Paper text:
Voltage-gated potassium channels (KV) play vital roles in electrically excitable and non-excitable cells. KV1.3 was the first ion channel discovered in immune cells three decades ago2 and exhibited only C-type inactivation. In summary, we report the cryo-EM structures of human lymphocyte KV1.3 channel and a rapidly inactivating mutant H451N. In these two structures, the VSD is in a depolarized conformation and the inner gate is open.
The H451N mutant exhibited 60-fold faster inactivation (τh = 7 ms) than KV1.3 (τh = 440 ms). We determined the cryo-EM structure of the H451N-mutant hKV1.3–KVβ2.1 complex and obtained an overall resolution of 3.3 Å. The main differences between these two structures are in the selectivity filter. The external part of the mutant’s filter is dilated. In hKV1.3’s structure, the carbonyl oxygen atoms of G446, Y447, and G448 in diagonally opposed subunits are 4.8, 5.0, and 8.6 Å apart, which widen to 6.7, 8.0, and 11.6 Å in the mutant, respectively. Moreover, the carbonyl groups of G446 and Y447 rotate and cause their carbonyl oxygen atoms to deviate from the central axis of the pore. The deviated carbonyl oxygen atoms contribute to the breakdown of K+ coordination at sites 1 and 2. There is no density at site 2, while the density at site 1 is stronger than that at sites 3 and 4. In the mutant, inter-subunit N451–D449 and W436–N451 interactions dominated, with occasional formation of intra-subunit W436–D449 pairs. Based on the cryo-EM structures and the MD simulation results, we propose that H451N-mutant hKV1.3 inactivates rapidly because the pore-stabilizing hydrogen bond network is weakened, leading to external pore dilation.
Author numbering:
A (entry chain C), B (entry chain A), C (entry chain G), D (entry chain E): 36 to 361
E (entry chain B), F (entry chain D): 106 to 210
Write the structure that this text describes.
Amino acid sequence: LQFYRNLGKSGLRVSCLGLGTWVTFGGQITDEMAEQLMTLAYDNGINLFDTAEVYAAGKAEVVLGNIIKKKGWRRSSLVITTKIFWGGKAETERGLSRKHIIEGLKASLERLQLEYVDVVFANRPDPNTPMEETVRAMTHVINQGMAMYWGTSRWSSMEIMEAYSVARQFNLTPPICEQAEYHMFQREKVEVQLPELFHKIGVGAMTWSPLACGIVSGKYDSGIPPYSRASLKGYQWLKDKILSEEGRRQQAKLKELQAIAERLGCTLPQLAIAWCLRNEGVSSVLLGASNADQLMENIGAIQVLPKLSSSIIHEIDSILGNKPYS
Amino acid sequence: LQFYRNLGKSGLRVSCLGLGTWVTFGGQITDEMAEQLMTLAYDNGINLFDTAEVYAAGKAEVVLGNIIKKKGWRRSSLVITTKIFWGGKAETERGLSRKHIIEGLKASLERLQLEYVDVVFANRPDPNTPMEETVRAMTHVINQGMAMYWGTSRWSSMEIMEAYSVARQFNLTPPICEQAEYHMFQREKVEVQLPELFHKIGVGAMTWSPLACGIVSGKYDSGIPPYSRASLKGYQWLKDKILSEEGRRQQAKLKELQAIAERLGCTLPQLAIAWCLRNEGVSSVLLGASNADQLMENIGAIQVLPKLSSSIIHEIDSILGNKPYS
Amino acid sequence: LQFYRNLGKSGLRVSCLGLGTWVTFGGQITDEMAEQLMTLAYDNGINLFDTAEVYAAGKAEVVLGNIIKKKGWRRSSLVITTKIFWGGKAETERGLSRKHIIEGLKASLERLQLEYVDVVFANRPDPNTPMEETVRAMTHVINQGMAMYWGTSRWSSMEIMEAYSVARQFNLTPPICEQAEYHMFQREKVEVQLPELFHKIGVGAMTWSPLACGIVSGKYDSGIPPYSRASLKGYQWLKDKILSEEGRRQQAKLKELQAIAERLGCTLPQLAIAWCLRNEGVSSVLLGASNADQLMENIGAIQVLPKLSSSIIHEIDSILGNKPYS
Amino acid sequence: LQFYRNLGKSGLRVSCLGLGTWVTFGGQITDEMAEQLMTLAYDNGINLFDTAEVYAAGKAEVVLGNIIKKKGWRRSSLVITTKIFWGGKAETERGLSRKHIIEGLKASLERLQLEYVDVVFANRPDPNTPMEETVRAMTHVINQGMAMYWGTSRWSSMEIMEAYSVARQFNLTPPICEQAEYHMFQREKVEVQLPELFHKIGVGAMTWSPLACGIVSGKYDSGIPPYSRASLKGYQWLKDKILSEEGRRQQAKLKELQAIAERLGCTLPQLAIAWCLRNEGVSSVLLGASNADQLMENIGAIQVLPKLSSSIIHEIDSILGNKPYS
Amino acid sequence: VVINISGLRFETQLKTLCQFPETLLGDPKRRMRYFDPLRNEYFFDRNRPSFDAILYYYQSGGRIRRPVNVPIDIFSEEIRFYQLGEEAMEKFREDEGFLREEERP
Amino acid sequence: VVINISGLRFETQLKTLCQFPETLLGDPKRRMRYFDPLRNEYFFDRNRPSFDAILYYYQSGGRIRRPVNVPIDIFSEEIRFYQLGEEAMEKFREDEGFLREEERP
Ligand SMILES: NC(=O)c1ccc[n+]([C@@H]2O[C@H](COP(=O)([O-])OP(=O)(O)OC[C@H]3O[C@@H](n4cnc5c(N)ncnc54)[C@H](OP(=O)(O)O)[C@@H]3O)[C@@H](O)[C@H]2O)c1
Ligand SMILES: NC(=O)c1ccc[n+]([C@@H]2O[C@H](COP(=O)([O-])OP(=O)(O)OC[C@H]3O[C@@H](n4cnc5c(N)ncnc54)[C@H](OP(=O)(O)O)[C@@H]3O)[C@@H](O)[C@H]2O)c1
Ligand SMILES: NC(=O)c1ccc[n+]([C@@H]2O[C@H](COP(=O)([O-])OP(=O)(O)OC[C@H]3O[C@@H](n4cnc5c(N)ncnc54)[C@H](OP(=O)(O)O)[C@@H]3O)[C@@H](O)[C@H]2O)c1
Ligand SMILES: NC(=O)c1ccc[n+]([C@@H]2O[C@H](COP(=O)([O-])OP(=O)(O)OC[C@H]3O[C@@H](n4cnc5c(N)ncnc54)[C@H](OP(=O)(O)O)[C@@H]3O)[C@@H](O)[C@H]2O)c1
């Protein structure tokens, strides 16, 4: 329906698709494909761009900050996020302490060459640091000007409620968003838990990896194609999930959904992206592409969403069968 | 009565007339008429100068910041305001979010070449952004030094009371003023609503467009004079309000008030400006002029106010007949 | 008794005498006498130096900031104060608003060439500005680093209690001191009112003009000596207070106290300074001198204080007779 | 057990040994031995480095800041502390006032050439300054960015509870640590008092001088060796504690503990360091060395700790006999 | 809205007080002199336990009780001070049992 | 959790309210419309002294009292509003002595 929607109940207006960053930027794909990938995504209305400080050991940000410096886009028209967690080998360089949030955002604001990011994310929950230190540290970088909002990522629905009860007590700022994984085979958290937080306290949801790193892309039925994600080093954990019997059963479940894709005049990635956007409790979907012909067919999946009637939803549920108990 | 009065219950002392800025500055009139218009207004005791960031697409501020840089006036003797709302084509460049208030005031503090404005105004209410984000954002730019006070504009009397109940809860700063339209044909809000807020919470009133963009100026009886406001492009909405039967009925009501102007040794703009200043619930009136001979006759309308007895008020009410139900 | 005492109940340690600044610095005396006056006062243990922004129309600070720049004293060993009130002809340049405290301290931190003063004083109470604006403005300049403490001057004992009930409510900083006039002929406020505030809330007292601008100095019995304070322009109000019958009655009361001065091996200024220091509710006395031979006899009045027994106090009370009703 | 443990309940992860700084750095040992002493301690996993502003009259920091500037270590991998108390001859240059914490940390951030220290310590309690001023001053330097945490040193267990009841009232930051002396002959405070604060409010313990300035090092049985600590000037108070009968009785108690050292394949300093680390209520031990062969045998005392069974603890208690009454 | 009866915080909605738009608390020009713009509340220096039955009169929609501790000469003043009207004053009458005297023919 | 009964702050644990997972306060979808995300509390505009015996019902584990000041037609509505159930409604019955009528054969 709406293209530009609010991030939860905050004032940030994000595009419903957002170009992410992983192994592609600074790693797998080159630097000229990266500048090509951003200019044909920014021109199609997408303003939300993600990164972190663990991607490519701090090289995914230098290839992202060089594009915006060269292309000359206004900073007021973009939304740049950044996650903080593992960015060092030392002991005092990974965590959600006050020393790492203030230093990690300051060092990742020179690789991006900016002056502030829009949202700064806590990449995973820290059990050693108390919750009062992480809420006080994220409010300090907002008030110094280094960010505008903050949000959690991979936190449970109890630790988001715990980092809100602290912020409403010490007069600090609560989080505005949450990054939770969401596709057709991991739909537990964003369907039964996060829609209750959106009505209670008003956090959003910014789902990541909607194609399960290319598993739902349908390229993994006959084996491993060359120059794919699983054919790179460090991704044996991905390849052992599709070579196993559990992944091939999902590949057996992808054959019937292939038939529902061609019925609606689309392909299977264009269904799986627009399947995530069928709700109102999801505020944006973080995409990912390796070349230009992958991306422009993914942005085209907005028009698939008005074709997504209640009948096609109700029988996709029959093929998957992993509807969570509500 | 008093020339320099307080802005509501705050500590800011403003002149009761203040030179505004619209289509004139940077648009209609030239740049040499603009520097002439400010030096013969600052020398007559007026210190309050208004602008915004939507006027002339961000060119009304460059012609205002160049005058104060050239004329060499002390910054401590002036009061410069600025409104924030529409200042971009993008989606994340118009609103009252935290991202636009902090960026829009920072970009409009380079076109003015200053270091801080005195009041920063919210130009119209935003329904998407919650009230806690706009009060927290306006308190952030005050504490960083980029402003001194803040106020609302075109907000209802409920959303000013809502942006005060938040500020007294989270220990933030409430607004000090409100810009509401006020002339002889729009006198509803500033007469029955805003005098109740001045006694309850202590906001002021800074009325804008006292001549209804030249309608009360008496130049629009025989048609459209050349080089007027209605004769410019983008002002068909003004011209269709005076060519309609509703505006000509107001022109029929301006013929009798023309007779009351010459009785008191003044003209009809000098009555209409001093008619607004007859209260104590109005703290300043924002003027507007196109040339020097328009302005010096408007500043002269201070002395008309001690001639404004209760008899002339009570029969001007009979000619207009739009006295609101109290 | 003790030389370096606390300023009230704060942590600031001030010398019990402090060299002030008025008509002498930048006005009456020259600039070479001024540098001579500071180096022979700083070497005798006095660290507290006063100024304001109305003295010599902003020239008493340029002659004070040039000495510390030239002599090369460490900033951590001094205590420099500054009062804010009248420092401009305009309407928005005098008051205790948020616009004048932030601008007046910033402009008076370039004439002093420092980065921060120690105490910033409100020179007289403002009836137009509400108390919540002046406490919020003085807490803003402390948190920005431009000052360290703040205090009131010429405020009544109710408006110091009102600027404390606000600061303990909105979580701001209360004042630490108060400048009240104190000599043998004005001893009402510092004896019956300010010792109750020192026990209740913990403010101090920093008395000013202990010789009543040279009236108690004994030089004004036979008339006006040349090159005195009363012989300068703008001081007719002083001269009409000593030429009147009321001042000559005080001169009649100074003849007997002249006899008590020579009994204790001192002169009459050395008694009147040490008469003020006989309490514990007074934390410092702000001196004032015109040449070197005036000052070194005034700093010597510390040793007169252990000679001040209860008998000499009880009969000085008999000569003056203005003991306030306790 | 664990090498890198949390500092109390905060998020700071410190090594259980930390190289301190006293008479050695900038004083006794040279500058080339100092750079040698840090590089062979940083390479063994120790990141916690201590200093203050009274050591060598402000020269222990210039020799510490020059090493990190030259060696090129990342600031995010270190933990640098600093204590504030006596750093001037003047009266307003020693204390825990707001004027000395803000100035003393700013001047000690140019001798270290850093931009922020990790913990800033209050070196001893101040009875003149109220507790609300010291908690407000330490929260001001944290929020300005000049530090990250703060802690107390030599404060009693009541003044740490008093500087916590204030911080939880005015919405400030409580301390996270406490430096208390701890060895075999001063074990009162860290064994019966500070383990109650770790469970109640969550402060840590960072013990200093574990060898009692070389008394437990076993070099002081036959007299004073040359080039020792007691053989330097200004350390007569140390020499009169080992030449007295009380210290020789401790030397009589060191002869039996010499026998327990060789039984476990270690020397007596390697026992005394690992004796302090046997608890969980102690978060780090601040070492001290004069040359390289002293230090590398002290870092080796980690492996002595798993040999420290309950039997060797229970009979070391029999030799000393100063077990506090629990 | 927040009402502070000499230290006790009573906090109810605005539409509850607007059910009776003729009383003290219902009229936005009569209660406006008891405002406190520093704490955003109305401060009355009245008896503490007598307001627990005044607020329940607005919430229930017309019923008048009397708490057990407050005597009758005290609770008859709070109905006179909050200007509840003679309709509410006579509803307090037969709740205490004392019926008013009938008009003579 | 914090419950704000028209100005009076009651603050209990979450596992106390989860002992009775069918009432108003026990069901996280029925009490969710009374939340207040600015102060992090639940705001009910009900009678003040009647909730002191509702909260003790959860804390003690099932007992129902009645405070002395609140009458029976008031306290019978708070059990109906907080949806304590007929088990708790009939436990309020014989506590007041009034036994229900037996079913005729
Ligand atoms: N907060 C966290 O903890 C966290 C952690 C990890 C990632 N993330 C975010 O998640 C975002 C999404 O990353 P993702 O790569 O996992 O999302 P994804 O959409 O599930 O992965 C897409 C991958 O499949 C391929 N692909 C996309 N469309 C295709 C199409 N039509 N046909 C064939 N192949 C197609 C692409 O190249 P290939 O064919 O070469 O595979 C791409 O690499 C990342 O950018 C990152 O910002 C967040
Ligand atoms: N907060 C908001 O949302 C908002 C929105 C809009 C404007 N404003 C403020 O309102 C302020 C007032 O603007 P305005 O122009 O609408 O006020 P105005 O006084 O009603 O308009 C005066 C216009 O009429 C003409 N005029 C003035 N005196 C005259 C006289 N004696 N005889 C003949 N013509 C005369 C002038 O030139 P012409 O004859 O050529 O017309 C001028 O353009 C603006 O400066 C702006 O700061 C605020
Ligand atoms: N907070 C406020 O509102 C406020 C207002 C005004 C002043 N103040 C402070 O008050 C401070 C004190 O100023 P003040 O001049 O009025 O104090 P003062 O001690 O009463 O005046 C001393 C004057 O008398 C003369 N004098 C001093 N000792 C003398 C001696 N042994 N023999 C003969 N003459 C002697 C000096 O030169 P002469 O002989 O030439 O007179 C000097 O000018 C000022 O520095 C200012 O900082 C504060
Ligand atoms: N917060 C406070 O108030 C405060 C006050 C004072 C100190 N401190 C901290 O305490 C820290 C520890 O200082 P410290 O010197 O007193 O600790 P220490 O470990 O008790 O003293 C060790 C001294 O003994 C010698 N030594 C060490 N190991 C030895 C070994 N195996 N064999 C022979 N000699 C050995 C060393 O050289 P020598 O043989 O030449 O003696 C060294 O000088 C300081 O760095 C400082 O940061 C804190």
